[PDB]
Design an enzyme around this catalytic site. Structure first.
Site, PDB file in Angstrom:
ATOM      1  N   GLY B  39      67.660  84.534  53.487  1.00 12.25           N
ATOM      2  CA  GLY B  39      67.919  85.731  53.463  1.00 12.25           C
ATOM      3  C   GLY B  39      68.416  86.412  54.652  1.00 12.25           C
ATOM      4  O   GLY B  39      68.605  87.738  55.002  1.00 12.25           O
ATOM      5  N   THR B  40      68.821  85.623  55.879  1.00 11.77           N
ATOM      6  CA  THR B  40      69.085  86.004  57.048  1.00 11.77           C
ATOM      7  C   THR B  40      70.543  86.609  57.034  1.00 11.77           C
ATOM      8  O   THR B  40      71.432  86.824  56.185  1.00 11.77           O
ATOM      9  CB  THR B  40      69.238  84.993  58.135  1.00 11.77           C
ATOM     10  OG1 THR B  40      70.230  83.914  57.844  1.00 11.77           O
ATOM     11  CG2 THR B  40      67.861  84.130  57.926  1.00 11.77           C
ATOM     12  N   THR B  41      70.977  86.984  58.321  1.00 10.45           N
ATOM     13  CA  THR B  41      72.409  88.009  58.419  1.00 10.45           C
ATOM     14  C   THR B  41      73.595  87.002  58.905  1.00 10.45           C
ATOM     15  O   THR B  41      73.413  86.112  59.539  1.00 10.45           O
ATOM     16  CB  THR B  41      72.266  89.028  59.322  1.00 10.45           C
ATOM     17  OG1 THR B  41      71.153  89.780  59.450  1.00 10.45           O
ATOM     18  CG2 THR B  41      73.385  89.834  59.124  1.00 10.45           C
ATOM     19  N   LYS B  59      73.371  76.635  59.364  1.00 11.83           N
ATOM     20  CA  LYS B  59      73.409  77.563  58.159  1.00 11.83           C
ATOM     21  C   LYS B  59      75.073  77.644  58.075  1.00 11.83           C
ATOM     22  O   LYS B  59      75.344  78.447  57.267  1.00 11.83           O
ATOM     23  CB  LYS B  59      73.084  78.957  58.615  1.00 11.83           C
ATOM     24  CG  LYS B  59      72.418  79.597  57.147  1.00 11.83           C
ATOM     25  CD  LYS B  59      71.775  81.116  57.290  1.00 11.83           C
ATOM     26  CE  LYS B  59      71.432  81.712  56.154  1.00 11.83           C
ATOM     27  NZ  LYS B  59      71.307  83.108  56.245  1.00 11.83           N
TER      28      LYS B  59
END
EC number: 3.4.25.1
Lengths: 231, 213, 244, 240, 97, 181, 243
Positions: B39-41, B59
């Site tokens: 759930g990172t940016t 990612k």
């Protein structure tokens, strides 16, 4: 006599299948192809069928890549070759998706030969009238296979197929050597092709592809011209 | 019937038992394994000569020599979707002999996500460069897409949109575009991976060849 | 004639001619030999793919491993043999998955012969032109050796031969085989003698053996040095015998 | 000229392909079956014996269940297929309903399976004929026969295969109520019937025995030779 | 069960119905007729159902020869873990069972 | 309901895998010098093990070689992602050596097949949030088999009735059962 | 179904002892049944197709007789051979272009369309139930990166790209003429391409042409849409040749 010549699913009284022999006869009347497996590389060469100035030189090719490390060439009928090439590419992609590594050459040859074995045991179809030469690099070691219209495959060191392939195989037997380099292999392949050209050979009527530890690639016409000038 | 030939695809042979088991375990008070989520940016912009994608820590998934993707949600779903689309695009490029187009990848991803009615659950940020210029998309788990000049997703999304709507101009150079993406990512988290695709590093006239990967 | 165009036609005296024609395709193939002893089983084959420009990139030709306890050899059409061997491996794995025990040797042969019989039963298809030899070990009967033919028939043997010049080999085996008093060395010598008569160099044969060691089956393929040793021992003993 | 297709009638109402399958049956080894008061016997001729062959794998008598067994004459692969189907059917029926399978039920199943394959031009019939014996739940012996066309009947003693007419005539002459009084007499009758066509007795004769509430028993060559010796002794005594 | 079971079971049939309806509306009654004739003709030359087929001609006609989906990499039907008796499967295919 | 705990540690030319015993089998051998450990529901563990053995046997017969740990991880991930909507309740852990290079490998997956490859240790099971910090505290690189066994035994023991440890080397495989005094 | 016919040249799926497919060779002879010939020439920044128009009946409406078709907005076509077969292939090509657009989000290229048609034609030669169509297709278009394109496919399933090509009754003489002209000169303007095509037709067929006897279609870089010329333009070009 001719009763057993028309049906594909009918054995002869001596135990022979004749339509497969006729498909091989179709293969033997195609354009010549040569494959030589040297140390640290493999070379494939063939003779173009579009020998005219009107034909475009970048539309359709006879030497094709399947993966980054596998290539292909043929003798026989082109329309069957196209569909076989598409199926081979799909099979390689499926193998990569499932196992997360590039497919080995032998496994791909086995899968293609399995697809080709069908169409020889059913009524209402005809066999593919084409043979393939398959080359690849795998685990620091080169490969060279051939597949027949019946679905049988062999591993070779050097071979020829198409028109005048018996004399080509005799030439290769006389000339082939175990400790050979890729450049000498290309020279020998071009010399073998030259034995039955019946005309003047240029870089616009032959096609060459090579495979080594960097992958499979198709040579540009300028490189073929440079190689031809060195003869 | 038992005499029917088998077929491939997903299997639904454990749904009823699973429902009963989770109900029983929830009522009795015991835990069961869970899926991994990220759930990172993630963010991306469009500048005069290409795209800049950013994430906080890879990612950033590979789709094509000119197309890249960023995902948020269940990790396995994003991996599987990106790999399937990459294989399909490689088959397409081998058949066609040219580098692919961003709209093709967008169409395939959107259709495949829509086919499964949002149960896959992958949110993606797609960007690339083709013969018609740079493009940037945003794809949602139910199969909806938006074409925008700047997108962001994740936890610190609002803190990144603030920076974007405050300090975004059309036709920026590469350096300050990278800097803007870096500030937008850093605002949300309060160490950053950047991907830059440029039209000057790609040849659209040369015949296609399989990349190293 | 009028009764030999399909597999679904009976002749007025009750014969299926297409099946016999299919079995006629096995006499052109290479010779395969099998011998059973007290402490092992043997498989000896003849190499037809002999040429200077051929490569060797495989485990072996015409000899395949089916599971941890069984192996086979083929004679006939290679492209059909490939399909049959793949199906054999699948059947063995399915049985192991379902029952958590290795499959008995006879059940595998029966299951493959059912598939071979279906292709003579149903119309529009062509029978397989393949004959197989099987060797293996199991806890019910110990060492075993079977044979199969294109019609779907099979049986157990103590010594048998398929392929080219099979009748002479069968006669020699009948003359020279001693029941219940042979070992692996005697079987190897007899196989060398029979092959030499029916066809000698180490590049034209391939031999595989099966044996049990510490409750584990061992499957091996002999090497060039061992084959040459056997050939030269046979030659010297033959010369010594004929010198008297 | 009406024998090229399976489903074609001749001008006088014959199906010739099924008759050709019967011809294929008529060339197998002879099989004989006799049922008695408390025993059923099956005997099969052995056509030839090869010394380098394992004889366990070429038997012509099988056991479908605990209360039924079968012998056949004709093609061997077809017989194996039919035997496997019947065994699977018996197992499934026993699992579904705990009652033992009826011999007439299994005979009807086999006959229906055989009759299914004479209906279309895309498949060929089974070229076998079968003899089925067993004991019912109440202990009543039974004996049935099946044909490639799909018909079946019930007998007291019958023979199939090569040289069956002479055996059937001998059985018609010699089958009496005082010849099936005892198990030994029944077995002697079966052996004597088989000896009409078999060149050498005992050497190439296979025989099976089934008693009430007992498993199938295969007689050994020692017992077979003892019975043959008893028959020879009584023949010598009756010579005079 | 799951809402996705029926959708995934009959995807190809629904796709065919949609495309055939659109084709009939745009061109006429002949185009779906020809397409169905071709499909039926090419779906008739295959192995017996207890062996694994390839469906090369059908894939060429239908357009599935440059696409890979989840039904091509998950639960491979070639390496199936259960298989019936050959004669039973052939009989079931013909409708006798 | 109990699921147990499984860990794997890597050292100098060796690797170990451990679980808790006393009730069913959790660690299964997949070829020589390659193991897989499963923690979760009792029936799902056995089903996954049997299906994986089926696939591995077929692959090794067809290819003609021994499998690599990375390929085994990919196969397990594919098999687990097959059941995406109703999944198995298992969490695999893989440890072994390269059949041609003899290099250690450890990884773990979730119930649908998301991998994670590390270089020091990996932990599975329901109580995966407790052995973690202890594992960092008690792990140092370049560790011989004896100290490796001691470390993994301590980490598996003083964190929760008996444990079982396998130590894999190029030459031999050692199995031990332990019980705290 | 019906059942094949015995003989080495009476069924599609039977090889001859020399490995030939006589039914495919016979389908190649149906292209000359119409009696017309067509020529396609590629220029520096344009491509043209020319074919002759025969109207033998006085009672026939001449506006309904044509062999020039529009596949998409940017792709043109000319068909030679059996008329109904040609129209059926035009419909199939339109359907395939629509599928490509829906599936990929951009318009199909000329080589991809030709390859798809050839792939469909290959299947008819390997199954016993369907028969090949007796016609050949020639396509022209403008590529965004490459430029003008000329492609052709035949009943066997074979396709290729050309600089100039011809089909019909008198294909060989046209091929020789075009080969000589191409070996002589390159870099033709828009006018010179039409001149060359009309000259090839009018030399191979010893006829002086009228504006009502030929049919011309063009595509160009400035206006990449397929266009069909009118009688006034054709007559202007004809007097340009005449002067």
């Amino acid at each position: 006599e001719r009763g057993y010549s028309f049906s594909l699913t009918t054995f002869s009284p001596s135990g022979k299948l004749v339509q497969i022999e006729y498909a091989l006869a179709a293969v033997a009347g195609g354009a010549p192809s040569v494959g030589i497996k040297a140390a640290n590389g493999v070379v494939l060469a063939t003779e173009k069928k579009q020998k005219s100035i009107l034909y475009d030189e970048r539309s359709v090719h006879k030497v094709e890549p399947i993966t980054k490390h596998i290539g292909l060439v043929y003798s026989g009928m082109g329309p069957d070759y196209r569909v076989l090439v598409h199926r081979a590419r799909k099979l390689a992609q499926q193998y990569y998706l499932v196992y997360q590594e590039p497919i080995p050459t032998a496994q791909l040859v086995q899968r293609v030969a399995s697809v080709m074995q069908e169409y020889t045991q059913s009524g209402g179809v005809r066999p593919f009238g084409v043979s393939l030469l398959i080359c690849g690099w795998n685990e620091g070691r080169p490969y060279l296979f051939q597949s027949d219209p019946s679905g049988a495959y062999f591993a070779w060191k050097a071979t020829a197929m198409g028109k005048n392939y018996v004399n080509g195989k005799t030439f290769l037997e006389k000339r082939y050597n175990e400790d050979l380099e890729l450049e000498d292999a290309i020279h020998t392949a071009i010399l073998t092709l030259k034995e039955s050209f019946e005309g003047q050979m240029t870089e616009d009527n032959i096609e060459v592809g090579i495979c080594n530890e960097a992958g499979f690639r198709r040579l540009t016409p300028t490189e073929v011209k440079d190689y031809l000038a060195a003869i | 019937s038992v005499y029917a030939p088998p077929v491939g695809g997903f299997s639904f042979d454990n749904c009823r038992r699973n429902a009963v088991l989770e109900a029983d375990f929830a009522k009795r008070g015991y835990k069961l394994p869970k899926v991994r989520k990220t759930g990172t940016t993630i963010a991306g912009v469009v500048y005069k000569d290409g795209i800049v994608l950013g994430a906080d820590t890879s990612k950033i998934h590979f789709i094509s020599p000119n197309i890249y993707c960023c995902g948020a949600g269940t990790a396995a779903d994003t991996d599987m979707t990106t790999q399937l689309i990459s294989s399909n695009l490689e088959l397409h490029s081998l058949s066609t002999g040219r580098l692919p187009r961003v709209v093709t990848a967008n169409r395939m991803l959107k259709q495949m996500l829509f086919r499964y009615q949002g149960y896959i659950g992958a949110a993606l940020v797609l960007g690339g460069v083709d013969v018609t210029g740079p493009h940037l998309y945003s794809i949602y788990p139910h199969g909806s897409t938006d074409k925008l000049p700047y997108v962001t997703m994740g936890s610190g999304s609002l803190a990144a949109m603030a920076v974007f709507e405050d300090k975004f101009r059309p036709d920026m150079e590469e350096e300050e575009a990278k800097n803007l993406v870096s500030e937008a990512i850093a605002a949300g988290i309060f160490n950053i991976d950047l991907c830059v695709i440029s039209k000057n590093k790609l040849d659209f006239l040369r015949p296609y060849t399989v990349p190293n990967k | 004639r009028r009764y030999d165009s399909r597999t679904t036609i009976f002749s007025p005296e009750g014969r299926l001619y297409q099946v016999e024609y299919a079995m006629e395709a096995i006499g052109h193939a290479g010779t395969c030999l099998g011998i059973l002893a007290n402490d092992g089983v043997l498989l000896a084959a003849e190499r037809r793919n002999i040429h200077k420009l051929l490569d060797e990139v495989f485990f072996s030709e015409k000899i395949y491993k089916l599971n941890e306890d069984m192996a086979c050899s083929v004679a006939g059409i290679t492209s059909d043999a490939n399909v049959l061997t793949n199906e054999l491996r699948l059947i063995a794995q399915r049985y192991l998955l379902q029952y958590q025990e290795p499959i008995p040797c006879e059940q595998l042969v029966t299951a493959l012969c059912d598939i071979k019989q279906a292709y003579t039963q149903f119309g529009g298809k062509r029978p397989f032109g393949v004959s197989l030899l099987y060797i293996g070990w199991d806890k019910h009967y110990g060492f075993q050796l079977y044979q199969s033919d294109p019609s779907g028939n099979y049986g157990g043997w103590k010594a048998t031969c398929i392929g080219n010049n099979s009748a002479a080999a069968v006669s020699m085996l009948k003359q020279d085989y001693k029941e219940g008093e042979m070992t692996l060395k005697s079987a190897l010598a007899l196989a060398i003698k029979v092959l030499n008569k029916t066809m000698l160099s180490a590049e034209k044969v391939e031999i595989a053996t099966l044996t049990r060691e510490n409750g584990k089956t061992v499957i091996r393929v002999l090497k060039q040095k061992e084959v040459e040793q056997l050939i030269k021992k046979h030659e010297e003993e033959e010369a010594k015998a004929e010198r008297e | 000229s009406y024998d090229r297709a399976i489903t074609v009638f001749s001008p006088d109402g014959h199906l010739f392909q099924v008759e050709y399958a019967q011809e294929a049956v008529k060339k197998g080894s002879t099989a004989v079956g006799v049922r008695g008061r408390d025993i059923v016997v099956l005997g099969v001729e052995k056509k030839s014996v090869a010394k380098l062959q394992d004889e366990r794998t070429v038997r012509k008598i099988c056991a479908l269940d605990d209360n039924v067994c079968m012998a056949f004459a004709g093609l061997t692969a077809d017989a194996r297929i039919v035997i496997n189907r019947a065994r699977v059917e018996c197992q499934s029926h026993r699992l579904t309903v705990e009652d033992p399978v009826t011999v007439e039920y299994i005979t009807r199943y086999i006959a229906s399976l055989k009759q299914r394959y004479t209906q279309s031009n895309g498949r060929r019939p089974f070229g076998i004929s079968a003899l089925i014996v067993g004991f019912d739940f109440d202990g009543t012996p039974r004996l049935y026969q099946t044909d490639p066309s799909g018909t079946y009947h019930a007998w007291k003693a019958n023979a199939i295969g090569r040289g069956a007419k002479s055996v059937r005539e001998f059985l018609e002459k010699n089958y009496t109520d005082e010849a099936i009084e005892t198990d030994d007499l029944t077995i002697k009758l079966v052996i004597k019937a088989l000896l009409e066509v078999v060149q050498s007795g005992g050497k190439n004769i296979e025989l099976a025995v089934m008693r009430r509430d007992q498993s199938l028993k295969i007689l050994n060559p020692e017992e077979i030779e003892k019975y043959v010796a008893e028959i020879e002794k009584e023949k010598e005594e009756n010579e005079k | 069960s799951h809402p996705l079971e029926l959708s995934e079971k009959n995807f190809q049939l629904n796709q065919d119905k949609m495309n055939f309806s659109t084709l009939r509306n745009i061109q006429g009654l002949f185009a779906p007729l020809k397409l169905q004739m071709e499909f039926k003709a090419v779906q008739q030359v295959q192995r017996l159902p207890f062996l694994s087929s390839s469906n090369l001609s059908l894939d060429v006609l239908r357009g599935n020869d440059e696409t890979i989906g989840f039904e091509d990499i998950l639960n491979d039907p070639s390496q199936s873990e259960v298989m019936g008796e050959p004669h039973l499967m052939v009989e079931y295919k013909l409708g006798l069972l | 309901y109990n699921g147990g705990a499984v860990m794997a540690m890597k050292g100098k030319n060796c690797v170990a895998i451990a679980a808790d015993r006393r009730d069913f089998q959790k660690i299964f051998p997949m070829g020589d010098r390659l193991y897989i450990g499963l923690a979760g529901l009792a029936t799902d563990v056995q089903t996954v093990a049997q299906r994986l053995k089926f696939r591995l046997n077929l692959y090794e017969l067809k290819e003609g070689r021994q499998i690599k740990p990375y390929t085994l991880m990919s196969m397990v991930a594919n098999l687990l992602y097959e059941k995406r909507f109703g999944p198995y309740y298992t969490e695999p852990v893989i440890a072994g050596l390269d059949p041609k290079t003899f290099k250690p490998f450890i990884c773990s997956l979730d119930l649908i097949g998301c991998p994670m490859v590390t270089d020091d240790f990996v932990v599975s099971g329901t109580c995966a949030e407790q052995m973690y910090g202890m594992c960092e505290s008690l792990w140092e690189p370049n560790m011989d088999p004896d100290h490796l066994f001691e470390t993994i035994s301590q980490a598996m023991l003083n964190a929760v009735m008996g444990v079982i440890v396998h130590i894999i080397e190029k030459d031999k495989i050692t199995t031990r059962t332990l019980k705290a005094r | 179904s019906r059942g094949s016919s015995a003989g080495f040249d009476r069924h599609i799926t039977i090889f001859s002892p020399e490995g030939r497919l006589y039914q495919v060779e016979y389908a190649f002879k149906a292209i000359n049944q119409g009696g017309l010939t067509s020529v396609a020439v590629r220029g520096k920044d344009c491509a043209v197709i020319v074919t002759q128009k025969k109207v033998p009946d006085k009672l026939l409406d001449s506006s309904t007789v044509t062999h020039l078709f529009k596949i998409t907005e940017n792709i043109g076509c000319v068909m030679t051979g059996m008329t109904a077969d040609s129209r059926s292939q035009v419909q199939r090509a339109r359907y395939e272009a629509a599928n490509w657009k829906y599936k990929y989000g951009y318009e199909i290229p000329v080589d991809m369309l030709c390859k798809r048609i050839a792939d469909i034609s290959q299947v008819y030669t390997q199954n016993a139930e369907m028969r090949p169509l007796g016609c050949c297709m020639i396509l022209i278009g403008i590529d965004e990166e490459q430029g003008p394109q000329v492609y052709k496919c035949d009943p066997a399933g074979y396709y290729c790209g050309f600089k100039a090509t011809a089909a019909g009754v008198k294909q060989t003489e046209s091929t020789s003429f075009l080969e000589k002209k191409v070996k002589k000169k390159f870099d033709w303007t828009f006018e010179q391409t039409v001149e060359t095509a009309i000259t090839c037709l009018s030399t191979v067929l010893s006829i002086d042409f009228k504006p009502s006897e030929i049919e011309v279609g063009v595509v160009t870089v400035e206006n990449p849409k397929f266009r069909i010329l009118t009688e006034a333009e054709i007559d202007a070009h004809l007097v340009a040749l005449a002067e």
